[PDB]
């Protein structure tokens, strides 16, 4: 047995989730006799071998492709060929924006067992069982893969712990398949204020309603010493600038010691940017809103009367 | 020119839903609507039809049973030209890879020049179908597109994908292509009362699995790539509720706030 991990990197830095999957992998394999192969794909992919060379990796495959960074044609080709050349029982991808661009391609093209954004993984006997969400993280769905020599899972980021230490994979090289990709990467693009890396935050979500309602949570925040922030919808609508979006695609509020989430439900991608704050207060009218399940204190109530009165005592 | 937009009617549960038996939530606690992503994706196609002095055909297509007609009617009303619903009871419980297949055979008949899909659905959040379509079809693809630069008939197209921590990356892609559209690429419209009304005269077009060359044997949970073993509600938290008044709930927040300064 082998477990195939595929790493992830962008613009020359190895993305942390890579190290998380090795973790996953290692905590999964049934006998320490089983190996864990890790591949890394890119025209300058070499650079990474020092960083990839770490506890848990038995083999490191470096795959020189046509492009520097992710490209769905190149990636599906390479992983297909590694799958062929290693016949893993289980191949693990980071459930990430790159992965979204190819992973389901793989699974479709042959019979592979397939499951995505999985956050618990384990064997029971000779039988792989995986757990992901349902009905908008209102339930867990526990699934299995009858019949499946090989199962491909995309893994949620920040669920699995990486290992401490250095190691010594056998390192190897392949050429990616010769693939004449049907898309071509161009420029990376960015579109003052603060960097919401900072102490105390008040963060509004859809919960608030209408652009006119922001001024009073802007004012609430001014008056507690809080920095106004928000979930994605507020910024999509253009009501606060994209600088103030917490989340998987906005900023991760690293030095936040206090975070009050008002009218934010706690989507997966919001938690991504804030799940590690030590004190999280959540105010929300819907008692089963996911945000409550990582808060320390919860209030169930309208954000509007919690607002005034706060703004009234302060 | 023709743009096919694939759309999903998704379920939300009400508070205090429960479970069968074991293997799903109770059919009663679900409310149906058009997947949030699909608004932006259909808007994007209408945005193309709108901007070009040539004729463009937007058609929406759904794999679902007939509670879905109601969502298709909404697409109709928001500008879409034609609407098609694929169904057989056999199809029930098909995961994203099977829906991929069913969508493909419809897309092979329609012959469109571009296909849009949603980054994900809000219920199952699989984030896999659209790209799966890309695969059976063998078309070029991109997932998670925040901006599209395309003119009907062009043969390359410049998109921007939205990456983690914020950045965007442009990518030039050949067309025909599939792309899965992200929230925020645009501000989708609301139907007008006239829209609602004319749409009420349109047909939603029924297509069965045999019409696309498929049978009981190609679809539904049995030919999916994952089998449900069971669902369950997760225990939800170790957190402290505060009960009582505004003056109190708020008095507490202010204690905590102050405990931190
Ligand atoms: C690839 C991708 C990237 C993403 N990136 C991000 C990201 O960076 N950041 C992000 O935030 N999301 C992100 N998401 C978007 C995400 O899926 C959700 O759509 C979003 O996080 C939901 O925002 P919300 O919780 O404010 O809205 P909702 O999910 O609509 O929740 C609103 C909440 O307010 C509550 N409420 C309503 N009225 C009141 C009231 N009067 N008093 C108290 N509570 C009230 C409701 O109970 C509800 O729980 C991303 C999604 C995708 C797939
Ligand atoms: N059953 C379906 N019928 C039509 N389109 C669908 C269906 N399921 C998924 N889709 C497409 O899949 C998208 C993304 O959600 P996901 O099911 O997470 O892959 C939706 O926006 C639709 O484009």
Curated annotation (Swiss-Prot), chain A:
PANTHER family: ELECTRON TRANSFER FLAVOPROTEIN ALPHA, ELECTRON TRANSFER FLAVOPROTEIN SUBUNIT ALPHA, MITOCHONDRIAL. The lineage of its organism: Bacteria, Pseudomonadati, Pseudomonadota, Betaproteobacteria, Nitrosomonadales. Belongs to the ETF alpha-subunit/FixB family. FAD binds at residues 206, 231-232, 245-246, 249-250, 265, 267, 269-270, 284, 302-303. Heterodimer of an alpha and a beta subunit. Forms a ternary complex with trimethylamine dehydrogenase. GO terms for molecular function: electron transfer activity; flavin adenine dinucleotide binding. The keyword Transport applies. Keywords: Electron transport, FAD, Flavoprotein, Transport. The keyword Flavoprotein applies. Coiled coil: none annotated. Its cofactor is FAD. This is Electron transfer flavoprotein subunit alpha.
UniProtKB/Swiss-Prot annotation, chain B:
InterPro entries: ET-Flavoprotein_bsu_CS, ETF_a/b_N, ETF_b, ETF_beta_N, Rossmann-like_a/b/a_fold. CDD domains: ETF_beta (cd01714). It comes from the Bacteria. It holds the Pfam family ETF. SUPFAM superfamilies: Adenine nucleotide alpha hydrolases-like (SSF52402). Heterodimeric electron transfer flavoprotein that accepts electrons from trimethylamine dehydrogenase. It transfers the electrons to the main respiratory chain via ETF-ubiquinone oxidoreductase (ETF dehydrogenase). EtfB binds an AMP molecule that probably has a purely structural role. Heterodimer of an alpha and a beta subunit. Forms a ternary complex with trimethylamine dehydrogenase. This is Electron transfer flavoprotein subunit beta. It comes from Methylophilus methylotrophus (Bacterium W3A1). The gene is etfB.
């Amino acid at each position: 047995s082998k477990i195939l991990v595929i790493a992830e990197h962008r613009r020359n830095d190895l993305r942390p989730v890579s190290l998380e999957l090795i973790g996953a992998a290692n905590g999964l394999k049934k006998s320490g006799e089983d190996k864990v192969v890790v591949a890394v794909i890119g025209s300058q992919a070499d650079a990474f071998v020092p960083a990839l060379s770490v506890n848990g990796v038995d083999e490191l495959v470096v795959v020189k492709g046509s492009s520097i960074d992710f490209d769905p044609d190149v990636f599906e080709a390479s992983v297909s060929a590694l799958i062929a050349a290693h016949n893993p029982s289980v191949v693990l991808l980071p459930h990430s924006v790159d992965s979204l661009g190819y992973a389901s391609s793989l699974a479709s093209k042959t019979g592979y067992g397939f499951a995505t954004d999985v956050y618990i993984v384990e064997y029971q006997g000779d039988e792989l069982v995986a757990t992901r969400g349902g009905y908008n993280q209102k339930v867990n769905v526990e699934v299995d893969f009858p019949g499946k020599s090989t199962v491909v899972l995309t893994i949620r980021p920040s669920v699995f712990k990486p290992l401490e230490g250095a190691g010594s994979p056998v390192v190897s090289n392949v050429d990616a398949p010769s693939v004449q990709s049907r898309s071509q990467n161009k420029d990376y693009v960015e579109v003052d204020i603060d960097i919401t890396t900072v102490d105390f935050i008040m963060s509004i979500g859809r919960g608030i309603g209408e652009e006119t309602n922001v001024e009073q949570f802007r004012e609430l925040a001014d008056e507690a010493g809080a920095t106004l922030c928000c979930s994605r919808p507020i910024a999509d609508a253009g009501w606060l600038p994209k600088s103030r979006q917490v989340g998987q695609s906005g900023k991760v509020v690293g030095s936040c010691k206090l975070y009050v989430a008002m009218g934010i439900s706690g989507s997966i991608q919001h938690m991504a940017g804030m799940k590690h704050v030590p004190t999280i207060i959540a105010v929300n009218t819907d008692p089963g809103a996911s945000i409550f399940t990582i808060a320390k204190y919860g209030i169930v109530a309208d954000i509007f009367d919690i607002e005034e009165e706060l703004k009234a005592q302060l | 020119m023709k743009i096919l937009v694939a759309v999903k009617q998704t379920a939300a549960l009400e508070e205090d839903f429960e479970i069968r038996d074991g293997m799903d939530v109770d059919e009663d606690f679900m409310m149906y609507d058009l997947n949030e992503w699909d608004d932006f994706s259909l808007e994007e196609a209408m945005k193309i039809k709108e901007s070009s002095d040539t004729d463009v055909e937007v058609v929406v297509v759904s794999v679902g049973p007939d509670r879905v007609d109601e969502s298709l009617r909404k697409c109709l009303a928001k500008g879409a030209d034609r609407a098609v619903r694929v169904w057989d009871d056999a199809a029930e419980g098909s995961d994203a890879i099977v829906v991929g297949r069913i969508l493909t055979e419809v897309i092979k008949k329609e012959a469109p020049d571009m296909v849009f899909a949603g980054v994900q659905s809000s219920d199952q959040a699989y984030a896999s179908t659209g790209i799966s379509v890309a695969s059976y079809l063998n078309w070029p693809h991109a997932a998670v597109v925040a901006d599209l630069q395309y003119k009907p008939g062009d043969n390359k197209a410049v998109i921007r994908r939205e990456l983690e921590g914020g950045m965007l990356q442009e990518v030039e892609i050949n067309c025909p292509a599939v792309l899965t559209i992200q929230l925020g690429i645009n501000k989708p419209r609301y139907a007008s009362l006239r829209g609602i009304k004319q749409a009420a005269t349109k047909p939603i077009e029924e297509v069965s699995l045999a019409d696309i060359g498929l049978s009981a044997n190609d679809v539904g949970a049995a030919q999916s790539m994952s089998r449900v073993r069971r669902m369950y509600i997760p225990e939800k938290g170790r957190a402290t509720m505060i009960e009582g008044t505004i003056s109190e709930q708020a008095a507490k927040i202010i204690q905590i706030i102050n405990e931190f300064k």
